[PDB]
Amino acid sequence: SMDVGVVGLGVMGANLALNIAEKGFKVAVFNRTYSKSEEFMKANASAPFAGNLKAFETMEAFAASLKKPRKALILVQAGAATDSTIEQLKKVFEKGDILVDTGNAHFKDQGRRAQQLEAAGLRFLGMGISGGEEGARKGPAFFPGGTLSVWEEIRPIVEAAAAKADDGRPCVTMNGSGGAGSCVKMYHNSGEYAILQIWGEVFDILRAMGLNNDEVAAVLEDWKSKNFLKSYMLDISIAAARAKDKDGSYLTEHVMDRIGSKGTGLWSAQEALEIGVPAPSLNMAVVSRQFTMYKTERQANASNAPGITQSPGYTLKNKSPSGPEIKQLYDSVCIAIISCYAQMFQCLREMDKVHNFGLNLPATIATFRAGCILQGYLLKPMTEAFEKNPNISNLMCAFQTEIRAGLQNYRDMVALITSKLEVSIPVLSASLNYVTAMFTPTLKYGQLVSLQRDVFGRHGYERVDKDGRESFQWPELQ
Amino acid sequence: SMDVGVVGLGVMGANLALNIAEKGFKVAVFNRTYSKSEEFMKANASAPFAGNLKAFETMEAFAASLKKPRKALILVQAGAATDSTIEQLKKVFEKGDILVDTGNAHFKDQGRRAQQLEAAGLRFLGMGISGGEEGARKGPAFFPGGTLSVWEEIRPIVEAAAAKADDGRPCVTMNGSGGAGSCVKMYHNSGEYAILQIWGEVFDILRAMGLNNDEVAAVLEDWKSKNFLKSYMLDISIAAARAKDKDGSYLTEHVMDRIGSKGTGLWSAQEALEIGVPAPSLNMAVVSRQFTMYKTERQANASNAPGITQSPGYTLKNKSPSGPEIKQLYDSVCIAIISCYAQMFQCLREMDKVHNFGLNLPATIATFRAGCILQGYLLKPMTEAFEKNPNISNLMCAFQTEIRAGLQNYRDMVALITSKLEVSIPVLSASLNYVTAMFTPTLKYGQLVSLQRDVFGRHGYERVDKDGRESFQWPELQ
């Protein structure tokens, strides 16, 4: 009798299964195209734990092997296929069993699937998984939401396969009801986008300033040694920059500049907008990708107006990590990244208030420390900040010191990049605005726009001295 | 019999009624609280066209008086209010009649309504209207869409009431089917958001640079005479700036910095994101308002980190429009505004192909020339530009000259404001990135990010030299 069943042998599904197999649990496996199951069993025939790997043919056979209550991690990356798979399962399953969708769809869909199901007798759980291929095999992070009782049943299996933080804690924790887990995964992917784009801009900026791919890597490597930015994403950027083609040249130069995406980012942007929390970096991260996808249009515009974007340029006198400007960039990045995290958490906090998940923010953040793509040093003090005072106005307050120290440098660096370089910095730019705007008591432009709306729409405006709305009597303008 | 009916007497309802009856048509009126109709016919009983106005009892009556096919213009608040009203009408009308919704619905709802109604034997028309209270009376712009059949039946009343642009052409045209008209209005409101914000930013910047409310007015005033920026919104900004409170001080100083919104801008942002078209200025326009609504949080953040946004500052030598700095700020705005319109139009271009509206852009953009909020000089050359080459890659090229000339000024100003001023410039900033990004053939950050996605997710990447997708082999990182 199998302890758990894993549905869908993808990048994640197969690695995850192994991980759980190696942890000692007997796992029934199942794929759409049985053939793949074969190839799978093949490449892993020799593993020392291949005895815990039972492959199957028919759902109905697969379902009987699992110890009641069955437990099935649906690892089929889809939207539709996930619903299709849920139907197959739902039929061959019995009252009480569990269906865990580790899927990657809108938290709103999870609220649906769950609700139908409980009324149909089966128990559901929407759970996120971050770590990628390696993370899946070695130990990712999970972000569950759903029935409180369902968690306790599954806890042993996931706590064992989760990555362990520097404090022995497994990076998994019940985040709250319904789609709470899928929401956290969504916003996680949201911050991921903003951060990857930040590194990407750094690359573009340094290249513009005269550094070649190797010299860039040395500054990333220096920044890694300074510790504050130590992160997975930083590591992969270094790999990405040093990478070389078969012909011995930098890979990056042969890469078509069009960034694909699969939606998590897009939705987080739309919901942030929906509920109304300001998250400029999260949006511009998606917009920045949209920029690339329009390769054809950009090429046409260029032809129509040759070198219109031309600037004076700025070639670096000191291409070494200790150079004055490179230190200016460093601070920029540190703050920029901090604001990305800030916005990400503010969205989550607000999302809890609105959907009432009963989210335990400091418990959730703690599970970001390893396995997931967002892992890195900064997660330590951020976890502590939210542990120390859970009702903090905003995450940036906790870093008031760091921020004061580099804010001017942040301002100078983008001022210089803007006037002198021929590079677009969507995210680095939006992030600075987030910082300046969020620490400003009175935004004057809000006074003007507020009045304007009254001029044509007669919407009225709030006053700082009275109460209620006031509407001004305006002269005709046509 | 009656020429046409109007339901709902908001700021828009009443005025449009008078607009229409003044033009020679008999207009049946209805409303929920018959009191409101009483108050309407009340205040307007002396008008030389009152005999072309008739307040009604019930829909039985209202629908009774109208020349068949009944044509009704619903003018109530969007949402459930509209839904109800259409249902009441539905009972009291007959095969062939026409329901013209004109109250700001998300273009997807209109397309649905169209079908509902079309399967029930009635005709529907989603028809946006813009111009505000004054414009509603003097003649605004209309953005209709749905069945062509209805259009030619309504063309007289809407043409006669709409504003006429220079060439004497009225600001109305059939925009396409279904929700094509509401879509145009949605994006019209989206450009409006961005541009209002740009003026608001100008106010903030000059105030920061030392100008008092009356001195900025003089700058705008000079900008108007330069003609290129002549626009409605410019005019109202001037009024807004000049306005004084009963205590004889500037109104803006007593205004609560919180910008309300009603959705159209929000959705335009979400759909632009959805179809994937890059509209950074349209997106940040909504965010900038979000920034203001978080007044409480901003106030708290400021208390926990006093003087954190403290900057060098920059006071101007001459507060006269002849000031060199004021001159570059001018180029900045010109260019900023041009990209706003550009983004707006690209959104519609793609919207049309995805949703197959059969929209004729040059006809559509021509109806924006007068009556609507976005009206101004620029709409003239822009209209020409699209009549000249309908499949021009991006409107920005048609303005290559002006861009080439002011681009560095635009960069230097933004650089200056970023470095020295204690103000946030969300949209002036995003718009500059839109310009630099859209004219750049190769965005290098796209190369890094592209590869990054491969590292962890094994998503592969497109090559500029091979064709298809490739995936590299990477070192373990954990």
From Swiss-Prot, chains A, B:
Q: Does the keyword Oxidoreductase feature in the UniProt annotation? A: yes
What are the EC numbers?
Answer: 1.1.1.44
Pathway where it operates: Carbohydrate degradation; pentose phosphate pathway; D-ribulose 5-phosphate from D-glucose 6-phosphate (oxidative stage): step 3/3
The annotated active site, in chain numbering, is K185 (proton acceptor), E192 (proton donor)
Q: List GO molecular-function terms, semicolon-separated.
A: NADP binding; phosphogluconate dehydrogenase (decarboxylating) activity
Family of the protein in this entry = Belongs to the 6-phosphogluconate dehydrogenase family.
User: Which purpose does this protein serve, as stated in its record?
Assistant: Catalyzes the oxidative decarboxylation of 6-phosphogluconate to ribulose 5-phosphate and CO(2), with concomitant reduction of NADP to NADPH.
In Swiss-Prot or TrEMBL terms, this protein is called 6-phosphogluconate dehydrogenase, decarboxylating
What is the native source organism of this protein?
Answer: Trypanosoma brucei brucei
Q: Which gene encodes it?
A: GND
